[PDB]
Amino acid sequence: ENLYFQSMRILVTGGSGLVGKAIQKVVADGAGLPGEDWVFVSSKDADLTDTAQTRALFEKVQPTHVIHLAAMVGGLFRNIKYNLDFWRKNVHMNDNVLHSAFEVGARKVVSCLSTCIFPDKTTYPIDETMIHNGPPHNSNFGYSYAKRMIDVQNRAYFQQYGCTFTAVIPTNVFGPHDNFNIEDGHVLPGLIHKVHLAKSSGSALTVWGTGNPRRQFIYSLDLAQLFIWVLREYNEVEPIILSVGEEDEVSIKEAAEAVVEAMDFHGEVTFDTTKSDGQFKKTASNSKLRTYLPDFRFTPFKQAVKETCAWFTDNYEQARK
Amino acid sequence: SMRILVTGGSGLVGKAIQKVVADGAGLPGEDWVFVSSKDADLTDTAQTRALFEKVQPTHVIHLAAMVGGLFRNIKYNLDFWRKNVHMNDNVLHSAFEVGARKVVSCLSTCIFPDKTTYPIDETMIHNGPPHNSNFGYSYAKRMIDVQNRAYFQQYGCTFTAVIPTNVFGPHDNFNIEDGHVLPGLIHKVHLAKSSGSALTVWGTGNPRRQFIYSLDLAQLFIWVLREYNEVEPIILSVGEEDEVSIKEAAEAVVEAMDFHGEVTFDTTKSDGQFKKTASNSKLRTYLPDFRFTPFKQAVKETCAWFTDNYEQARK
Numbered sequence: 001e002n003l004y005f006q007s008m009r010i011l012v013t014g015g016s017g018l019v020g021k022a023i024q025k026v027v028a029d030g031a032g033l034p035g036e037d038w039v040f041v042s043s044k045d046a047d048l049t050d051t052a053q054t055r056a057l058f059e060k061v062q063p064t065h066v067i068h069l070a071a072m073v074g075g076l077f078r079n080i081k082y083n084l085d086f087w088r089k090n091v092h093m094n095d096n097v098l099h100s101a102f103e104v105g106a107r108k109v110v111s112c113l114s115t116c117i118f119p120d121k122t123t124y125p126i127d128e129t130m131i132h133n134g135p136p137h138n139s140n141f142g143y144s145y146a147k148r149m150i151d152v153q154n155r156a157y158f159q160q161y162g163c164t165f166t167a168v169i170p171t172n173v174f175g176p177h178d179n180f181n182i183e184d185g186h187v188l189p190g191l192i193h194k195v196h197l198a199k200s201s202g203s204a205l206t207v208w209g210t211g212n213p214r215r216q217f218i219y220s221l222d223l224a225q226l227f228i229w230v231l232r233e234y235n236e237v238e239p240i241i242l243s244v245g246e247e248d249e250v251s252i253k254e255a256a257e258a259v260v261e262a263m264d265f266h267g268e269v270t271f272d273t274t275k276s277d278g279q280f281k282k283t284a285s286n287s288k289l290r291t292y293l294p295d296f297r298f299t300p301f302k303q304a305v306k307e308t309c310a311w312f313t314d315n316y317e318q319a320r321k
Numbered sequence: 322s323m324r325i326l327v328t329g330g331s332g333l334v335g336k337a338i339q340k341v342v343a344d345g346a347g348l349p350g351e352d353w354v355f356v357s358s359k360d361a362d363l364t365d366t367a368q369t370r371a372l373f374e375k376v377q378p379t380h381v382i383h384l385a386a387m388v389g390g391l392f393r394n395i396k397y398n399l400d401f402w403r404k405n406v407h408m409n410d411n412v413l414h415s416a417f418e419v420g421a422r423k424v425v426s427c428l429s430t431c432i433f434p435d436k437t438t439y440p441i442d443e444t445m446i447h448n449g450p451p452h453n454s455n456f457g458y459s460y461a462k463r464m465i466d467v468q469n470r471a472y473f474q475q476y477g478c479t480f481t482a483v484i485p486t487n488v489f490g491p492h493d494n495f496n497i498e499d500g501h502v503l504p505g506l507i508h509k510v511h512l513a514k515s516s517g518s519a520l521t522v523w524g525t526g527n528p529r530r531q532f533i534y535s536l537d538l539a540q541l542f543i544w545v546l547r548e549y550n551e552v553e554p555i556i557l558s559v560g561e562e563d564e565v566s567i568k569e570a571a572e573a574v575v576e577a578m579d580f581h582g583e584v585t586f587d588t589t590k591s592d593g594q595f596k597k598t599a600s601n602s603k604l605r606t607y608l609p610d611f612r613f614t615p616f617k618q619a620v621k622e623t624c625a626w627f628t629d630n631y632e633q634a635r636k
């Protein structure tokens with residue numbers, strides 16, 4: 001074999017989700033170099049809360065590389081309900097996946113964190129350094145902390161065994177193959193489904209909260225292309241933030257409007273201010289990711305919202321809803 | 322009618338709790354059950370589930386954990402993380418599903434933010450990363466609080482914890498390499514008395530610590546199971562004025578044991594965290610009149626115990 005460009009058997013967990021289908025999409029699209037064997041799995045292949053199944057899965061595949069996306073995910077409102085299930089299930093899934101990869105002897109693992117998890121009381125903009133610098137917002141602390149403990153387990157495997165187990169930190173993500181369930185899903189898909197039912201019913205659109213909170217949104221495909229570059233080129237253990245820039249941060253109100261424009265909605269737009277705004281602001285820096293890939297161009301927000309609404313609309317029956 | 326399960330019953334703190342209930346602090350209608358790892362490896366779900374099935378615990382005091390001095394922690398943060406996380410999830414979940422009235426796990430003053438104001442209190446537990454020497458351990462104990470807060474918020478379970486400072490007592494782990502400062506310094510002075518060696522105290526001898534005699538802890542712990550109904554944990558420590566330096570601690574031991582040799586410091590060895598001064602103000606709003614056992618007196622009783630049970634003692 002080649003000492004300098006070596007065979008890869010790559011295991012992607014949570015491969016059927018929003019982020020997972022994007023990587024499939026780009027890889028099937030021709031970003032997969034020769035001598036790379038990609039295996040994407042879902043919970044059908046093995047329930048990663050379970051140790052026996054995970055280990056068995058990890059024996060059957062013999063991955064050199066891991067992208068660990070499998071996690072119980074949800075919007076603000078789902079997290080509020082089940083902080084204990086977000087805590088127990090994700091920590092089991094992460095401990096099983098990291099430890100299986102370890103004893104299988106995998107060369108590298110990139111787990112997946114979130115801007116969600118940073119300290120509520122904070123200086124802005126946030127960055128990789130500040131990950132454990134105070135408690136997270138109380139709305140989603142179960143999930144937050146389970147992610148924080150990935151960073152923790154990463155450094156321990158690395159400090160004790162020299163494992164190149166690291167992670168990425170995406171902001172709020174959106175795109176095709178999302179969870180469009182309104183109750184349990186994120187703001188952008190939830191508004192999309194909402195705008196779809198509204199157009200169809202003659203109803204108003206009800207945007208939850210005040211509309212003033214601020215968010216950074218990354219398109220699943222933009223994120224997938226960085227994810228691919230990370231697995232290959234990036235070799236620190238300290239995680240890296242994958243986010244659109246500071247200047248590209250937006251209110252919930254403009255997000256709603258963007259969906260609206262795109263789906264040609266012409267009915268009333270109403271805000272339910274009784275509902276929770278959650279965390280107001282988690283503004284995050286990409287200066288690090290910039291020092292690596294200074295000339296990468298993110299797909300403009302409004303464009304990505306067009307492509308995502310068109311995807312939902314022409315895949316409405318197949319989508320998760 | 323209480324059926325109390327004490328995990329880690331065979332450890333330093335556990336023996337202490339066993340000494341006091343037996344000594345008489347058991348109240349009628351309390352069925353005290355102490356266990357150790359031969360009863361069940363709490364890192365295994367199946368075993369943990371089965372213990373909690375046979376025993377039917379109205380209450381749980383959860384001392385069980387992988388524990389060590391600075392120098393063991395430094396080496397083994399991946400174990401310290403993983404093993405403790407497993408035990409605690411297993412115990413807290415079993416407890417929940419047997420439906421216990423109350424669990425009292427055990428945190429530490431170790432696990433507080435390195436970068437902090439002093440004195441440290443219950444409020445600050447998650448206000449920054451812990452020190453790097455024991456991050457694994459530390460984080461695993463914090464997550465107990467996270468998990469505690471999760472069970473109480475979703476199902477209302479009265480799951481809390483206590484935050485003791487450095488403990489010491491009879492039945493401690495006197496393994497010098499793996500154990501805490503005091504029992505290691507005790508083991509050292511004894512091997513020195515037999516050998517005619519100098520005593521080498523590791524570090525500069527300047528770090529500051531708060532020591533609490535297990536026997537004191539025992540009682541406070543016992544009180545907690547009974548009377549303490551906050552989910553937020555409670556610091557159980559000697560007062561802020563009773564903090565001792567390692568040189569003073571070394572001296573204390575040398576007096577008790579009547580050691581006449583030379584006392585020496587290997588300044589190349591880690592000092593760990595210089596200071597973790599903790600406030601017991603909360604505990605005093607409950608127990609204003611609880612007198613702590615003077616530190617020298619307590620040191621003598623451990624040196625006395627150790628010397629007199631050298632062979633049975635964990636060395």
Ligand SMILES: NC(=O)c1ccc[n+]([C@@H]2O[C@H](COP(=O)([O-])OP(=O)(O)OC[C@H]3O[C@@H](n4cnc5c(N)ncnc54)[C@H](OP(=O)(O)O)[C@@H]3O)[C@@H](O)[C@H]2O)c1
Nearest residue numbers: 014015016017018019042043047048070071073114172173
């Ligand atoms: N979406 C965001 O806004 C966002 C932002 C930052 C970070 N992230 C992180 O990115 C990762 C991917 O998120 P996503 O948005 O793609 O979530 P998603 O679309 O809901 O997909 C979750 C994936 O995890 C799998 N999964 C869930 N529970 C499992 C279990 N018990 N065993 C095995 N597989 C299981 C799912 O498989 P099934 O199809 O079988 O259910 C699915 O493939 C997560 O780690 C998340 O924390 C997401």
Ligand SMILES: NC(=O)c1ccc[n+]([C@@H]2O[C@H](COP(=O)([O-])OP(=O)(O)OC[C@H]3O[C@@H](n4cnc5c(N)ncnc54)[C@H](OP(=O)(O)O)[C@@H]3O)[C@@H](O)[C@H]2O)c1
Nearest residue numbers: 329331332333334357358362363384385386388427487488
């Ligand atoms: N000592 C201190 O300075 C200090 C300070 C603050 C807080 N604490 C906390 O106080 C608690 C008690 O500590 P300690 O000083 O008494 O420790 P210790 O003397 O080493 O005793 C540890 C206990 O845990 C049990 N144990 C360990 N691993 C186990 C496993 N896999 N399954 C079942 N049982 C297991 C041991 O049983 P075996 O006898 O079978 O090994 C033993 O009974 C711990 O939670 C510790 O974190 C200690």
Ligand SMILES: C[C@@H]1O[C@H](OP(=O)(O)OP(=O)(O)OC[C@H]2O[C@@H](n3cnc4c(=O)[nH]c(N)nc43)[C@H](O)[C@@H]2O)[C@@H](O)[C@H](O)[C@@H]1O
Nearest residue numbers: 075076116140172186187190191207208209213276277278
């Ligand atoms: C990245 C994600 O961030 C999550 O916080 P967060 O950004 O508020 O997650 P979202 O649920 O995407 O955002 C909720 C914000 O958008 C408003 N909002 C308006 N309309 C809707 C709607 O139709 N659906 C939803 N869901 N919100 C809506 C809501 O009031 C709140 O300010 C974390 O809790 C998760 O852990 C997750 O990882």
Ligand SMILES: C[C@@H]1O[C@H](OP(=O)(O)OP(=O)(O)OC[C@H]2O[C@@H](n3cnc4c(=O)[nH]c(N)nc43)[C@H](O)[C@@H]2O)[C@@H](O)[C@H](O)[C@@H]1O
Nearest residue numbers: 390391431455487501502505506522523524528591592593
């Ligand atoms: C309460 C305990 O606190 C621990 O920190 P910590 O107080 O430094 O734990 P110890 O190991 O008790 O203390 C180590 C301190 O005592 C000095 N020292 C001097 N002589 C000795 C000796 O003979 N043995 C040891 N071990 N130290 C010695 C050492 O340089 C350092 O300043 C945490 O890492 C644990 O998690 C644990 O829970």
